[PDB]
Amino acid sequence: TIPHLAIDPFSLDFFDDPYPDQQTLRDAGPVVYLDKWNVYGVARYAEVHAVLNDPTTFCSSRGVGLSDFKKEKPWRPPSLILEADPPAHTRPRAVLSKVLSPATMKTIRDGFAAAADAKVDELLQRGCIDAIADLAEAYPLSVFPDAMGLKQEGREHLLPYAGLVFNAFGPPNELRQTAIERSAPHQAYVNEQCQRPNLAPGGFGACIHAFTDTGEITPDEAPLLVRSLLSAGLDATVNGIGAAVYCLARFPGELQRLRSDPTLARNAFEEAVRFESPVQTFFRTTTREVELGGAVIGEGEKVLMFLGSANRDPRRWSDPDLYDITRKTSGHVGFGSGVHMCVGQLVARLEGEVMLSALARKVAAIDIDGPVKRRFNNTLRGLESLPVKLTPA
């Protein structure tokens, strides 16, 4: 009843162009079995959304990568938020929600926007730049570590650590093995910065520690919650912003609409998140036998959710393969859905909005003008190099 497919959704050939295989995955049925890794897969919007919103059966506490924490040792101590279920999830979630709250965004908006404006003006003086290293990486690097309250020394470990975290959700392929082997210096750096004395008063890290006073988290929980922000908080936005610039570069008509109304910046970013889905996949593990899409899945089985595929499913989206900055994006699963829906989404959207706003106001054209190189990661979709010429407005 369930179709078996040999597609390896973690192969380099798949990463290079996932779209035909994602259609095959959707069209084979609502639920598939992936023989390469012995996991179930869901690739249509309806089932991906349903699984995300069914945490009592499709749990996160046994890991959201391929590895089942009941069977294997986690490569690092479990995330108190990503890799926890309610009720254990609830209070640490509330702390991060408050630390990255709407009220908090007020305190960082002027600086984040100023930094985006300045970066775009700087890039316009150069003309011919790499939209990854010089923009998608450089901009979040210029604002997020500071907002975290990180010291200067050691920041070169941030992106490598994140790449490791995202590769480690994958199967034990070469990407994962290479990421984990020797990773100790990256881990040592991040773990050290999670300790209270290393975090600047006022920053996100210190604010997490401040919540230990309230009874919501204990002092020994705080470093792991800071670790969560240092895991997801930089690399995901790098790939979100890179996705947005790549979209604007490929769809000049949409760059022109954005220029004509810069207030579309926020939705232009949200649409980039749907269109590229920088975070491609997460797993769940069944806590019990469960029927899904007419398919009976046993207990303790890994289920792979294709978020990127769900975000391009023609059953749900009109012209899913088009970048449309005025699309009604609500309901997309690029930030997840339900109890684990991205707790850093206000920070992500703030960064994306203010960068797209700066481009909207200052740039007339974005032309790809050199070889484009893809970056391969078991979880992240994005580019390694995106040479572009920026034409000033």
Ligand code: HEM
């Ligand atoms: C465009 C950028 C981003 C994307 C596409 C993204 C994507 C996601 C997704 C899909 C999830 C759901 C995980 C699941 O259901 O298992 C998630 C959760 C999470 N994200 Fe984001 N993220 C982004 C930016 C950020 C930022 C900026 C931060 C922190 C500053 C962050 C921190 C987190 C954390 C801590 C969770 C776990 C929440 C929970 O388990 O309750 N992310 N993110």
Ligand SMILES: COc1ccc(C(=O)O)cc1
């Ligand atoms: C969305 O990707 C991540 C990655 C790591 C974590 C974490 O370490 O808690 C959360 C979200």
Ligand SMILES: [Cl-]
């Ligand atoms: Cl770590």
